[PDB]
Amino acid sequence: ALITENMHMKLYMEGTVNNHHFKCTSEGEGKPYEGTQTMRIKVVEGGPLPFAFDILATSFSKTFINHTQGIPDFFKQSFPEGFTWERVTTYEDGGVLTATQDTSLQDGCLIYNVKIRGVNFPSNGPVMQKKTLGWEACTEMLYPADGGLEGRADMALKLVGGGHLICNLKTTYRSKKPAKNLKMPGVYYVDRRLERIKEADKETYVEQHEVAVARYCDLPSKL
C-alpha cells in the first residue's frame, strides 16, 4: 500500500571516473508492479563527461520490478524503511566501477542517493573513446545471502561496428527493515532491458527506460 500503481522518483548522484568528478540529478516515474520506469537525467557538474554515459546507466531502481509468480518482493517489502545497494562492475578491459546507493520513501516519492567511483578505464578503450551504443538485455540472478540478497549478472555493451565489451556485476542488496518483518524469496531471476531513449548536449541530458520482470526458471524439472 506504500508503493502504489504509479510512483515518482527523484535522484542525486555524485562521483568520479578515473580522475574526473561529476554530479547528476534525475527525475522520473514508472509502474512498480508492471516493472517499467523512465528517468530523465541531467549532468549538472563536470559535464560534458570524458567517458561514455553508458557506464552510469545501471546506477540510476529495484522497486520497479514486476515480481511475478508470487515471488516475495524484498524491495517492495522494505518500505517504509527502504533499502540500500552496493555493487562492483568489472569490465573485461580493466575498467572497474563501484557504486553505493540509498533508497528512501519521502512524502510518497522515491528518493535515490547514489555515489559512483570508477577507476582504470583504459584511456584508449571504447568507453573513454565513446564507441558505445547502449546495453543488450540481460538476466540477473538473485539469491538470499546473510539476511539480504546478492545479485549476479554479465552485461554486454554494444560497440560501434558490431561487437561487445563485456562486464560482470556483483551486487549486495540490504533492507533497512528488520529481518523478522521480511519474507525472503528463494533464488530467482530478473529479465531486464535498459534502453537509452534520448540524449542531447554531448550526453549531459539523457533519458533512459527500463522494463524488468522477475520469475523462477520456467523449464521443467526432473526432480
Numbering used by the authors: 3 to 62, 66 to 228
From the manuscript:
Fluorescent proteins have facilitated major breakthroughs in modern molecular cell biology. The first mutation, S158A, has been shown to destabilize the trans conformation of the chromophore, whereas the second mutation, S143C, was intended to impact the cis conformation.
In the structure of far-red-emitting GmKate (pH 10.0, determined at 1.8 Å resolution), only the cis-conformation of the chromophore was observed. The absorbance peak at 598 nm is indicative of the anionic form of the chromophore, similar to the state observed in mNeptune. Chromophore-interacting residues reside in positions similar to those observed at neutral pH. The green (pH 7) to red (pH 10) shift of the absorption energy of GmKate can indeed be attributed to the change in protonation state of the chromophore from neutral at pH 7 to anionic at pH 10. In the chromophore region, the only difference between mKateS158A and GmKatepH = 10 is the loss of a hydrogen bond due to the substitution of the S143 with a cysteine. This hydrogen bond may stabilize the highest occupied molecular orbital (HOMO) that has electron density concentrated on the phenolate motif.
